Homo-oligomer: A and B are copies of this chain.
Amino acid sequence: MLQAGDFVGVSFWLVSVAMVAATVFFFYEGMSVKKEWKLSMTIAGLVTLVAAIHYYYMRDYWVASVLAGSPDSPIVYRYIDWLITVPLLMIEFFIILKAVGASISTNSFWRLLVGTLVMLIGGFAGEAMLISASLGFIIGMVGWAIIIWEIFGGEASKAADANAGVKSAFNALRLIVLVGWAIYPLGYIFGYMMGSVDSGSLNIIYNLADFVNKILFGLIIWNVAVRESS
Contact = CB atoms under 8 A, between A and B. Distances in A.
A205 to B, nearest CB: 16
Contact of A49 (B10, B21, B42, B76): B21
Interface residues of A, number: 42
Contacts of A27: 24, 28
B21 A32 contact: no
A32 to B, nearest CB: 6
A30 B38 CA distance: 12
Nearest to A72: B4
A24 B1 contact: no
B10 A29 contact: no
A160 interface: no
A45 to B, nearest CB: 7
A135 interface: no
B81 A17 contact: yes
Nearest to A11: B80
A22 B136 CA distance: 29
Most chain B beta-carbon contacts within 10 A, residue among A14, A17, A74, A81: A17
Contact of A42 (B29, B54, B84, B128): B29
Interface string A1-20: 11011010010011001101
B21 A84 contact: yes
Nearest to A129: B5
B2 A21 contact: no
A53 B59 CA distance: 15
Interface of A: 1-2, 4-5, 7, 10, 13-14, 17-18, 20-21, 24-25, 27-30, 32, 35, 38-39, 42, 45-46, 49-50, 53-54, 57, 60-61, 64, 74, 76-77, 80-81, 83-84, 128-129
Q: What are the 5 tightest A-B residue pairs by CB atom distance, in nearest-first order?
A: A13-B80, A21-B46, A1-B61, A4-B74, A17-B50
